[PDB]
Amino acid sequence: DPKLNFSWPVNVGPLNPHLYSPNQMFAQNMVYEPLVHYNADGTVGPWLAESWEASQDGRSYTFKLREDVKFSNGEVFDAAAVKANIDTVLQNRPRHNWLELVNQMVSAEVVGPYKVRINLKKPYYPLLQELSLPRPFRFIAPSQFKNGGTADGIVAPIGTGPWKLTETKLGEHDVFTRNDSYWGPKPAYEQITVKVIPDPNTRAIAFEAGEIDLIYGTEGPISPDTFERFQKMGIYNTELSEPLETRVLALNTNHGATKDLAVRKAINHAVDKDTMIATVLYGTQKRADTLFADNVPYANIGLKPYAFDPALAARLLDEAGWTAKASGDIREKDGQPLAIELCFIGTDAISKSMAEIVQADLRKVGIDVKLTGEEESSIYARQRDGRFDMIFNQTWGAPYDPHAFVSSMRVPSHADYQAQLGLPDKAKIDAEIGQVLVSTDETARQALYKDILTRLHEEAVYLPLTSVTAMAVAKPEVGKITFGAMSSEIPFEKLTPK
């Protein structure tokens, strides 16, 4: 059976299901599995739990587990194993409390041999999405606990997944073997070797020499340069996923010229995102016309894009009192120039190149963008103070969207809060956000998000720029790449070599 060589900058880690770095999320996803599965269209479906019910008040969920699942060592996957895992996570609460699902979780109880009930302090509809995460709610054989838990180490990384970790060589590789007693469909590949290649130039050469078959990742492991270099050779398979998270400029409704709706709309009409993507990103990301893409839960609401239309942008400006003396002039309104400050982290090359593109494009319609590249700490001070006209931001990505990012909009010291402060409907928006997070009603939930996202779009609070995507470069014999529904999901089990 066929074997795959995969490159990664680092070793996969010890693969503890309940800890973070140095454990790599994609590798945790190969070995361990969640109760429920996040789909690429934003829905959540059955996985280790075949069924579930939420109590009427939304504070308890009872999961009915599959009855045909074994851990890779042959031990039973059941309600007892799930509770044992949940409990060791909750006993290490300080590590995990950043996740609002954990923060609201009171307890787990065994209510049948294959039924587990999860209890919350208050309703929290994103429970299902956050259960689909690579960590911390995936399941190791409890026999692998050390001293009654996982927080201080595990015996061996024994999961229920389609892959088993069978060899680790630090600085060299990690080898995963197909789990031939996996409960689901069996992988076409018998073996996945993760080769440790931290140096991008070495990775390129290794891919040339045929020492690795697949490269896969987002902005992190793969530069636009790297993807461009391979896609132009025209002999490999190169593909991009569906949108994962959105990069935006937040425009400050409470500060400067961006207080004016016409100016914010003009900005949305005057940046050529397609050219920005083509030049700065080498086509490795997709144009975003809305804050959230239509594969984000509750966000498929048919918002109309602001089309690239610099003449219209000029008409919106002039028709708001921001007029140009002559053709190429910086516009003015009551003595004052149309100058706006765009603040970004000065050592971030991509953001910097994007900011320079924004500056050039907006200058064409009479806007003087001042570029203020500064250190991260200085940028966080600006976000919280509202001392910006435009500032870069990013959504959280699947499966955290839209709830995580929207939730932060109503919290002071977040960029989005400061940027939205000038909206007359800010208090109402913040009330709807509070209501949507505790909503137990799916119809109400869609209506609430529709209203929130529609107001943010129509009031042009954002300049949505790009959708980050997973990139894949593969030898043609690997076949079509099936992309994960979240950035940390690399579906080796779905590869079918030709």
The CATH architecture of the largest domain would be: 3-Layer(aba) Sandwich
> What portion of residues belong to β-strands?
15-25%
Instruction: Look at the structure and give the CATH class of the largest domain.
Output: Alpha Beta
**General form:** globular
The CATH topology name of the largest domain reads D-Maltodextrin-Binding Protein, domain 2
Rg (C-alpha, Å): 24 Å
- Profile the largest sheet: 6 strands, mixed
Kindly report the name of the CATH homologous superfamily of the largest domain.
Periplasmic binding protein-like II
Helix amount: 25-40%
Distance between the termini: 12 Å
Protein name: Nickel ABC transporter substrate-binding protein
Family: Belongs to the bacterial solute-binding protein 5 family.
Keywords: Periplasm, Signal, Transport
GO molecular function: heme binding; nickel cation binding; peptide transmembrane transporter activity
Features:
498 residues; alpha+beta; D-Maltodextrin-Binding Protein, domain 2; Dipeptide-binding Protein, domain 3; four-stranded mixed sheet; globular; peptide transmembrane transporter activity; periplasm; SBP_5; Nickel ABC transporter substrate-binding protein; signal
